[PDB]
Amino acid sequence: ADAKTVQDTVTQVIEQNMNGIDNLMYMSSNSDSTGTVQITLTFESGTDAD
Amino acid sequence: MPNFFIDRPIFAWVIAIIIMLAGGLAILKLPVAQYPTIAPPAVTISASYPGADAKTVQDTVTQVIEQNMNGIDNLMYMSSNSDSTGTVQITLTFESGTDADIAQVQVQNKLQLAMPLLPQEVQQQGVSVEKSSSSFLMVVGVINTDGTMTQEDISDYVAANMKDAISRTSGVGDVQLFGSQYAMRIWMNPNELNKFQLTPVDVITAIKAQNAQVAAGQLGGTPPVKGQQLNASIIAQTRLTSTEEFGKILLKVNQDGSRVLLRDVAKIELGGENYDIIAEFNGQPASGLGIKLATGANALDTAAAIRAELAKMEPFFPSGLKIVYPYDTTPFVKISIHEVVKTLVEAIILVFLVMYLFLQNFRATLIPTIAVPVVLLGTFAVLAAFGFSINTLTMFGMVLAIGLLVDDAIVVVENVERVMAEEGLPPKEATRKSMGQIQGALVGIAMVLSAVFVPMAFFGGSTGAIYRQFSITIVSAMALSVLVALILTPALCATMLKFGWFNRMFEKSTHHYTDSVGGILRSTGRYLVLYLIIVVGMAYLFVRLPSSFLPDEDQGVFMTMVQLPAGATQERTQKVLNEVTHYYLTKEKNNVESVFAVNGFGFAGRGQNTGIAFVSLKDWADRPGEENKVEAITMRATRAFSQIKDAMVFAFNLPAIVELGTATGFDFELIDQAGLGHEKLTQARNQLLAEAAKHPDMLTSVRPNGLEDTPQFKIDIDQEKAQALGVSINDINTTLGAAWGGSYVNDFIDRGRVKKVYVMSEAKYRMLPDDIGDWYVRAADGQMVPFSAFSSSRWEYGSPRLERYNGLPSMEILGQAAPGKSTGEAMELMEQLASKLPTGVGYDWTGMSYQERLSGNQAPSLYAISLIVVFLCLAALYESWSIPFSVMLVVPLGVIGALLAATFRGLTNDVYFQVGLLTTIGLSAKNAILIVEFAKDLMDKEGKGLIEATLDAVRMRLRPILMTSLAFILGVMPLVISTGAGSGAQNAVGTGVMGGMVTATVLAIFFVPVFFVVVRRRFSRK
């Protein structure tokens, strides 16, 4: 029961903060109707995933 | 090798090109920041509890939380604040180079298990965990200079339309807003409220149901019916998004169709979430944004892009929202970079000027000019090899060293212009013989200079990190050099190599000189004394000479500290800020560029009571005379601000490395170590404080860095009476709660942004212990009941700030050493004074005092091992367990004279001094090794004069020294040693090297050719 709602409520927020993190190349999130959200960060090759 | 290289010099330019390439490309990969990272890694832990107080925070939250920091790796110590405004910081400093990213995990990670025991008020505000830095890169400010937007208004914008915009820009390692963002405010009044028999709770529990976010399946999705067609998503209740819809909330309805709306019982409007810190820029409403570096990005680079992004977006939203920059640590860095660069560049011009005056040539002075930039560049690649960076510390690292490579160059091309001179052969055969008589010396002095340098970078903590900066710099330059002077120079001067007021005024002063030195050497131990004075002298000057870390400097800004007393008030505090502002703009109007003033940011707590005012002056330029400088402007201020009402208002210049170990002072912490309550500790604290005033011998200013108990208004619910009337102990407390300290209902959305919703009494019904009488609660039978009915009130003292060191109620005192005595010996007293307190009370040293204690004194222990490797190394340069001795006794010469940073100027043993004091002992013992080389060499090869050589030795030597030692001093003499601004360390570095270098030459010309004589004759003697 949540159009936008999710994004801008959980999405934007978790996104706002994904800043700082080293070796970041691009972020891309997809807020979903089902209420599901999926933020995704990907780093420069080599970077140490743990 | 060089002999194989002089033969193919074609190649020893490829070796030279590579290096230059590496060092060029490395330049670009270099990050640039003002300093490097030198504080051990800390981690704060903040927390809120709207309307609490220290106990009601130390025992609901800071404890608890803290009973759980167990499990976490490399931790040094952990303190914690619990003050009277709902705040809880809880920073945790950690061993030297532990991985910050991984410590913050666990710290944080381990919080995650206490939250279950935090109270629900707190877990809603949420506890954040982050890395302790509170003062970095630049701090944009956003004011409105046409009274439209208030603090909160401006904050919002800055939050809503630009904060993230910056936040994601090449650099921006973290933003921190200087205000809030709107929040649904809902200020009730017991009156309009008690008239409907509704309390805060009734209001609270409505703003819930009414403003919430429900759930409601699709249509198909989950298993549907055969042959269905439309699946759609149902959209049930969803959060209000306005003061409008908020205004309309069914709170009550009673036989009248009576419509009692949230709009009646109180008053709705957007506003800020916290309201107790008034920011304003030059008497204008303001709401800045601070921005921290980035980790590995570039101070310059990223400042520029911030300025970019800010530009581009300022063409927006009505009323002039003008972006100001009351702080940018960048101009300061760039001007340093711009100097130093000239120091080097010019240092070379010097080696061209000097050297000409000495070697009739040109294609000779072209050599060190092709060696220097080759050695610099290229060390810029060793810096990038060890992950280092272009920062103040690392730069002066090569300037303090400019004189060590430059030398090296001259030294080679001037032995060739002797050998092909003193009945020599052509360029080739000259080099071969020349570059081959200093060959092994040029090495060996390698291994030597590696010690008396390496040893740094082994030191303590916060410091010692600095030291490392310097150490690897130099040694990376230094040795990199010695390597080109065995490869590119010996092929560069061969292959290239072919006024009366000099030459015709030198060839004879040499002779006068060596002659003068000639004889005066029979009674050898003539000047064996005289010297012994010198040494003994230093051993005086040293002790006499004061100590420091880094000389403070004029930077963009500095600050004033206001502090109204005991229980003052934001409003009463503002006026003080307005003055501070005034007696700054308008009475210092040709220097103060702006004052950014905020009340609520004390430096030893918060509260309406204290504030602080950061002032940004105008460009070092428009600030000419020493009177127009910081270490001057603040003087006026400090005083001019005495003569102020009950309002301690200080002003002072920030230290070199904001975020680092301040004064040579101490940081002491008195621990609760048992039962003993607040009180007992206080009496304890007070014992020792007073005890130490009685001792201004060992100097002091022992001061509790913390807050005296103030009085406090104490409610007190009568449980029984509560039970007797129909009145819930819960219902009471939320009403009194909410009312007076305000509660944070739930969220709502506002122009696409979730934002909090607070609800608390108007200000009118919550200022005075009276008013409490305005508040009514609905009881069981449904009759409003006043406080007095079930509660009584008394004054009393309690602590607005409860502080506590690792786990345990503590109290922190700080103070200085002694205008005479050492930080060290001053701690020791403080400790004996501690030694006699009541039993319960323990004591522990934190902070600067932590390192200083732990590591601290090692200078001895370390350089012992150098002075040994120096010997060893040196001994096998020659081939005796004694001869090297003739190389060592140089150390004192250079030292004295370098120590006339005392007797000539007004300085201190500060780092920049000691690094130089090393750079200086390198040319000194270098000189020695050579003169003691050519001492034997022709004494050993041509079996020459047991003393005859010595004279000749020094002869073929007075020009190298005189040559270099000239271009140096002059090189170090410029703005270096005479400066205005963005400097400090310039005076630092020069002055040290400037003297001492004098004595190193002008005094070793005589001794070193001695020494060698006084010895080389004490061994196998009769």
Ligand SMILES: CN(C)c1ccc(O)c2c1C[C@H]1C[C@H]3[C@H](N(C)C)C(O)=C(C(N)=O)C(=O)[C@@]3(O)C(O)=C1C2=O
């Ligand atoms: C002193 N510190 C650098 C400044 C300077 C200027 C400012 O204008 C401000 C601060 C602190 C920040 C802290 C923040 C905090 N937070 C990020 C929401 C916060 O928890 C509070 C609070 N005490 O409730 C603020 O007052 C606060 O909103 C605030 O208004 C600030 C603020 O206005």
